[PDB]
Structure 1
């Protein structure tokens, strides 16, 4: 599913991401924009052989199982495929664990490089939240 901006903002809020670990909703929407372009089916193969999955490009080295990332963990206790669902519940629940892991949203390279410090409120502009 390719979410619209405000549609994703709404879904993330429903699932309790807004202000989770002090990160306003706009940070999460911005992260999703630059991680996946709002596409739940987004995947990215990394050089280390791991893969990023879903609207927030959650990585198989730690967070989900894809059966093809040797030595990796599955801390969200899900198949990585669950992160590709039109329903973002699994991605959000896993994002919550990730952002609590110690480095906050810096876990998302696109957030750090393209959202952090910017006017993230713009990502929820016009949205009926």
Structure 2
């Protein structure tokens, strides 16, 4: 499913992401925009052979099992395919563990490079939240 900007903001808020670990909602919507372009079905393979899955591009080397990443740790205990669902619950629950990992949202390279220190409030501007 391809989310609309405000539609995603509302689902993420309902799922407890607004200000989770200090990160306002705009940060999460900005990250999804640049990670997957709001598409739950997005996948991207990396050079190390792992693959990124879903709306938040969660990596198969540490967080989910895709059955083809040798040495995967599956920290969120879910098959990576669960992360491509139109229901974002699995992606959100796993993202909460990732952001609590000690590096915060820097775990997402697109957030670090394109959202960090920008006016992220613009991403939820105009939305009925």
TM-score range, shorter chain: over 0.9
Q: Per-residue deviation at 1:72?
A: 1.1
Cα-to-partner distance string for 1:33-85 (whole Å, 9 max, x where unaligned): 00000000000000000000000000001000000000111011100001000
Q: Partners of 1:27 and 1:12 in 2: how far apart?
A: 11
Query: Counterpart of 1:44 in 2: which secondary structure?
Result: strand
Q: Partners of 2:93 and 2:54 in 1: how far apart?
A: 13
Query: Counterpart of 1:70 in 2: which secondary structure?
Result: coil
Q: Which runs of 5+ in 2 are unaligned?
A: none
Query: Counterpart of 2:44 in 1: which secondary structure?
Result: strand
Q: Per-residue deviation at 1:12?
A: 0.3
Aligned length: 129
If the length of structure 1 is used for normalisation, what is the TM-score?
0.99
Q: CA RMSD in A?
A: 0.4
Q: Which runs of 5+ in 1 are unaligned?
A: none
